[PDB]
């Protein structure tokens, strides 16, 4: 599978220079104000999408659970205990079928959006990330998947929905990908903020994934977008559930509550230094479990990609129905039988007489985001056997569910198993060890954080998200020293979910940084000496030939270092372009194999899209007339058909007259970032990653271009293979 | 005044390559573990320094105020009302004198450390930033300045103290400035975290000031440092004030408290949408005041630098004593007369009979960080006249105090005037307008935040610091939409305190970003064509001549494009170094004015320090023998005398034998970052800023070096002058 990176690097050429000359300070200030307005609109739209999803998820869930409640109440008195199962199965299967059809419509909507957002922020452009149909399919599939009791979440796909909104809103200026990547960073930040209630967590997630040079003017805007999203979602959701409209009573979709201890016990604390030891042991034991999660889930995915994906589209819908059937049967049987109902608004009474409520029913039949509040702020409600069985039956089914053709998330099903484990360990420690003054909410929170660390294996952004979700600043060390321990324990075995699922698809991904040994390798070894080049004043026949034959997206405009009009024009351009030191000072004062691999002086870079745009129009001059005669496309005309540039195969190829010269000098990028063949892989990777650039040319000390480097030359597998070859040769 | 930038850019040469060859994966893992240990030690040391400062500040303040309390109690009954003033003056003047002597010892300790940290993180190396004596002088001057009632703070100098600790601890490896800058970033983050209780605010401050490429492995470490500092300071300060040791009851030196409303009023909220309008009007009115602050303070500083600084050292001590005398007299008179004591542990009863407490006395005679809690969480304690007079008498004296030769801060004196203004506006709105359900704590907090925005004019970091100090996540929009409004209102008049005070000193500072028009200017216009160059295999006489004559810190190793042994060796090196495209593919398969301004082929960069190190040793070969004979200094030997490299004037110049060839090829940086003369100022600034590099060479398309660019070529004044010249010429 092949993917095309983003054109993030700014191309400054003659039309851009003309536009810059036209633009003054006042126009720049107006442009910046319009950018602020667009950012605010993106944030508000993300908040409204979150409100939509939450409102219909709650409506459908409450409706189906009320029907099931009445059916159970009647059928238990009758003793049938079967019709309620049939109605629950009907609801679950219908919802899962409606959620899977929408993913069959748009395949990229399957699963959490983070694997498809880590790549776009990396600039890989997975086909179908940012599109209206993808947004509609994911939004309408989340509320039909989580409402079906599939043990999935809503805060995962919110990031992808925010990214799509942020890519879509600015496009009615703002055409270039240099702005689109920033706007999708803002959209992802807004999505995270609306999902978890943490705006700073969202902006740090956007900074961490879209790694680039520090841009304060953009970080301020993305922080504003996150705050606006999380404070319009708050405003609507606290004005709908309650009666007060102006109040801001509840944060985004996932909130933990108020972590306060009872005032009766003065000795009680949120956490103490002595408990910190447990916070590392829960970090390891949880982290190992996270690794086990990976060890299962990957083994499932590689199965499906070999036995489920290459099957007719009728399959991948039967699998979703099977998963829904199994999870519904497991939930119903576990609540009916294994549930140990004890004596007494989210309290469920099932299958046993009055003044008795099933803890299992309160865990399963409540919403997942409402089964975390009980695990955090209720003590004595849950027996150890119930917690153990809930952890077992919510860990296997979570592994089995993720990957099927429905929208899903992995932050609630991972925050719930961890919370159950923390509650279980707190109960065990309180009972057997007898260590008093253990606030079980802290242990449940630490278990949830450790399980996220083991499964997701994120840092910085995850720590901030958790800290701002807890709404406590004193719980900053226990949360972070367990994320770090879980990450270090789970890194010995295998990577995280998102890294695994972006490596399975074959996406060319640049890692965070290189190892120590990579500096042994030089930039002369990862480049490709064989080049496809475009002369200035080249023939149109040569352009169409190299465009149809080759699939590269950028060509170095070069001149040979060692017809008549073409050669004369190239020589004149070479003489005029070069700027000597003495000439510059004077200006300031005035005020076969050898033929195949030929010395070529590097002059610039021209994209395939720009060449196609030139070919479509009549931008070309006959050899008889001078090079001055050119239509001279402006910036606006060259930016037309931006989202989808025409292909060379699409173009008619009949109207174009071959053997007629075309000038590519005014439109190329005369000053791209260049590296020497002696540069080490660390510096090359640093430029290619932080600058977000593409098609880095390697030029030696004589000025001749000696190679070209793209993302495919800097992938981890390529570096490992080249390092192994370097070791073998010496 | 001249300043020398940091050598942040990594120089990879032959000794470094040998060390890399020796180093394996296990040694790298051990190195990374040692780095983690160093980061943790830096955080713990910063926390302990904060504990030291807080404990002695509290001890001295409580002692002097107890003595003053007893003296007032006796003298008011006697009616003398004078001996208490004498004792207070004695304490204040003694403390201020002891604080000013320590700044006369170390001049760079004067004022807040942020102006001297924004420059070091920018890589300017102001002389005396990171030194043991500077740390001792600042730490022992803060507790003698704030204890003297000088209307100053402690959280400002904590950043500088953390930076000094982070620069000092790693140096017992870790020698190069590439590590020192990262460690001072971690130290500044730890200082901010210990000062304000916000670790994430500290790491974001470090990211925002030391602008560079994204480094996750470093951001994780600096976050760990901040958390460790703020949780060891918490552990000690909550175990000393209280009896419980393991508990973490209070955050760092500046805490706001618990922003909760009374449970009696259900209708009450922290803030509502309708109040948001006021939050922008307080943003403007406060911001304007901040501008006025600047408009005064700068006018004072430019006065002193012309009438106080060029005076004997006896002056700058009399001024501090005068300021202390005036502020003590003002405090005593305002509390004695203007105080309107009302009927009833931080409650002060002065000069009026029983069951009456002076609100003015409770404002002034309490610690400044304890006069913010009252303004946030007490209603009806303060009359409008008292608040107005307190704002007037705490705004003029704050302007007058800052800049004198004592350690000081500007976050408490700015957080207290803003809090007083917010309390006053809340009282006025409640009384006259009658708008009920107004929680005055929110108004005081918004006033304080708006005043900080007007004075300090920071974003991102300041917003996070305030949000985590308030310990509330729902107060995230009102705080930020008032910082942004204050910044936009105060930017029309003049810049912030720190920018003003770093522009007065003449520090060459790179701004956050360039304007729109700067892209009109090219890299050919900001470079210097006149070059001081070093040939490979150059004569030692030429090196000593160009080292003594010129003050540049880097020279391009070049060869002429157009004795006998020297010329032969240079020609051989030029032939061997160049790597052609065909040659590389074959290797892979095998497996006057004109004389002054001469074409020179760029090969590398050699620093002045490296040349001096080579000259000190006998690294040189006679012309009779070949170039193979070289002592070949290793990496460890070249890294000796790192903190202070020898000067060319210091070296004897007698033992060195002139006219004897020296080879600089093995030790130069063969692959520095280069730019084309056609690059625009935006890209050049981006590389020079984010990469943190130094001495960027401009090389044309023939491979000849055409210019050199340093920080002095990218300062705002230089760009403005060059743009004006460009406009004038055309
Ligand atoms: N113009 C070019 N001439 C020769 N080789 C090239 C050229 N551009 C890229 N390459 C190299 O060819 C290989 C594959 O190129 P490919 O066609 O996949 O690149 P691309 O699609 O233009 O790049 P990207 O995936 O970064 O958008 C890589 O090693 C790349 O460095
Ligand atoms: N080797 C050099 N030859 C010629 N000009 C140079 C050289 N190095 C720097 N310059 C230029 O000379 C001017 C002043 O140089 P200066 O001596 O102040 O630099 P420096 O002290 O080496 O640099 P820095 O302040 O970045 O540490 C600037 O325009 C700078 O770009
Ligand atoms: Cl989720
Ligand atoms: Cl997810
Ligand atoms: Cl301060
Ligand atoms: Cl300060
Ligand atoms: Mg491709
Ligand atoms: Mg200098």
Curated annotation (Swiss-Prot), chains A, B:
Keywords: Antiport, ATP-binding, CBS domain, Chloride, Disease variant, Endosome, Glycoprotein, Ion transport, Membrane, Neurodegeneration, Neuronal ceroid lipofuscinosis, Nucleotide-binding, Phosphoprotein, Repeat, Transmembrane, Transmembrane helix, Transport
Pfam annotation, one family: CBS
Primary location recorded for the protein, binned into one broad class: membrane
Residues of this chain annotated as glycosylated in UniProt: 354
Placement of sequence motif Selectivity filter part_1: 111-115
Keyword Lipid metabolism assigned: no
GO biological process, one term: signal transduction
Processing and modification events after translation: N-glycosylated on several asparagine residues.
Site, as annotated: Mediates proton transfer from the outer aqueous phase to the interior of the protein: 155
Modified residues (Phosphoserine): 634
Tissue and organ distribution: Testis, ovary, small intestine, brain and skeletal muscle. Low level expression in aortic and coronary vascular smooth muscle cells, and aortic endothelial cells. Isoform 3 is only detected in kidney.
GO cellular component: endosome membrane; intracellular membrane-bounded organelle; late endosome membrane; lysosomal membrane; membrane
Residues that, per the record, bind ATP: 552-554, 710-713
Chain ranges on the Cytoplasmic side, renumbered to this chain: 494-730
Annotated CBS domain residues: 527-576, 668-729
Residues the record lists as binding chloride: 112, 411, 498
Listed SMART domains: CBS
Protein role: Voltage-gated channel mediating the exchange of chloride ions against protons. Functions as antiporter and contributes to the acidification of the late endosome lumen. The CLC channel family contains both chloride channels and proton-coupled anion transporters that exchange chloride or another anion for protons. The presence of conserved gating glutamate residues is typical for family members that function as antiporters.
PANTHER family, sorted: CHLORIDE CHANNEL PROTEIN CLC FAMILY MEMBER, H(+)_CL(-) EXCHANGE TRANSPORTER 6
Protein name: H(+)/Cl(-) exchange transporter 6
Organism listed in the record: Homo sapiens (Human)
Encoding gene (name): CLCN6
């Amino acid at each position: 599978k092949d993917y095309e990176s983003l054109d993030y690097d700014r191309c400054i050429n003659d039309p851009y220079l003309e536009v810059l000359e036209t633009m003054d300070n006042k126009k720049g200030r107006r442009y910046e104000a319009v950018k602020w307005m667009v950012v605010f609109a993106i944030g508000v739209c993300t908040g409204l999408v979150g409100l939509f999803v939450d409102f219909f998820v709650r409506l459908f869930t409450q409706l189906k659970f009320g029907v099931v409640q009445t059916s159970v109440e009647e059928c238990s008195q009758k003793g049938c205990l079967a019709l309620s199962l049939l109605e629950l199965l009907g609801f679950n299967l219908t919802f899962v079928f409606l959620a899977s059809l929408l993913v069959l419509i748009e395949p990229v909507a399957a699963g959490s959006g983070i694997p498809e957002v880590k790549c776009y922020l990396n600039g890989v452009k997975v086909p179908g990330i940012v599109r209206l149909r993808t947004l509609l399919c994911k939004v309408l599939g989340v509320l039909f998947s989580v409402a079906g009791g599939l043990f999935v979440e809503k805060e995962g796909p919110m990031i992808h929905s925010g990214s799509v909104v942020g890519a879509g809103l600015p496009q009615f200026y703002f055409r270039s990908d240099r702005d689109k990547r920033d706007f999708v960073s803002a959209g992802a930040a807004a999505g995270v903020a609306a999902a978890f209630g943490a705006p700073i967590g969202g902006t740090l997630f956007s900074l961490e994934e879209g790694s680039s040079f520090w841009n304060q003017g953009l970080t301020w805007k993305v922080l504003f977008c996150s705050m606006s999203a999380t404070f319009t979602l708050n405003f609507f959701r606290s004005g709908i559930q309650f009666g007060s409209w102006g109040s801001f009573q509840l944060p985004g979709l996932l909130n933990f509550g108020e972590f306060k201890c009872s005032d009766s016990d003065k000795k009680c604390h949120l956490w103490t230094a002595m408990d910190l030891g447990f916070f590392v042991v829960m970090g390891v034991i949880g982290g190992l479990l996270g690794a086990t999660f990976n060890c299962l889930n990957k083994r499932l995915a590689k199965y499906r990609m070999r036995n489920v994906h290459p099957k007719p589209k009728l399959v991948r819908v039967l699998e979703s129905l099977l998963v829904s059937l199994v999870t519904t049967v497991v939930v119903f049987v576990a609540s009916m039988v294994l549930g140990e109902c004890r004596q007494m608004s989210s309290i469920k009474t099932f299958f046993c007489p009055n003044d008795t409520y099933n803890d299992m029913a309160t865990l399963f039949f409540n919403p997942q985001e409402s089964a975390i509040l009980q695990l955090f702020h209720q003590d004595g409600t849950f027996s150890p056997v119930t917690l153990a069985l809930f952890f077992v039956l919510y860990f296997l089914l979570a592994c089995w569910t993720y990957g099927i053709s429905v929208p899903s998330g992995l932050f609630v099903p991972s925050l719930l198993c961890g919370a159950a484990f923390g509650r279980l360990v707190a109960n065990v420690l309180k009972s057997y060890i007898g260590l008093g003054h253990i606030y079980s909410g802290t242990f449940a929170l630490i278990g949830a954080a450790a399980f996220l660390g083991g499964v997701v294996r994120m840092t910085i952004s995850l720590t901030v998200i958790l800290i701002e979700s807890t709404n406590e600043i004193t719980c900053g060390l226990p949360i972070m020293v367990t994320l770090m321990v879980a990450k270090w324990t789970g890194d010995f075995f295998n990577k995280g979910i998102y890294d695994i699922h972006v490596g399975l698809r074959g996406v060319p991904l640049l890692e965070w940084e290189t190892e120590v040994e990579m500096d042994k390798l030089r930039a002369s070894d990862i480049m490709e000496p064989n080049l496809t080049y475009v002369y200035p004043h080249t023939r149109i026949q040569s352009l169409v030939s190299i465009l149809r034959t080759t699939v590269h997206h950028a060509f170095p405009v070069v001149t040979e270092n060692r017809g008549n009009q073409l050669i004369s024009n190239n020589i004149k351009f070479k003489k005029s372009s070069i700027l000597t030191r003495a000439g510059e000072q004077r200006k300031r004062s005035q005020s076969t194999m050898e033929e195949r691999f030929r010395p070529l002086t590097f002059h610039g870079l021209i994209l395939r899209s720009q060449l196609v745009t030139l070919l479509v129009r009549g931008v070309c001059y006959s050899e008889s007339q001078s090079s001055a005669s050119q239509p001279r496309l402006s910036y606006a005309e060259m930016a037309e058909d931006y989202p989808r540039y025409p292909d060379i195969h699409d173009l008619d190829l009949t109207l174009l007259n071959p053997r007629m010269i075309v000038d590519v000098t005014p439109y190329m990028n005369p000053s791209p970032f260049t590296v020497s063949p002696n540069t080490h892989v660390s510096q090359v990777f640093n430029l290619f990653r932080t600058m977000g650039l593409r098609h880095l040319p390697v030029v030696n000390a004589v000025g001749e271009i000696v190679g070209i480097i793209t993302r495919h030359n800097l992938t981890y597998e390529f570096l490992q293979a080249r390092l192994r070859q370097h070791y073998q040769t010496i």
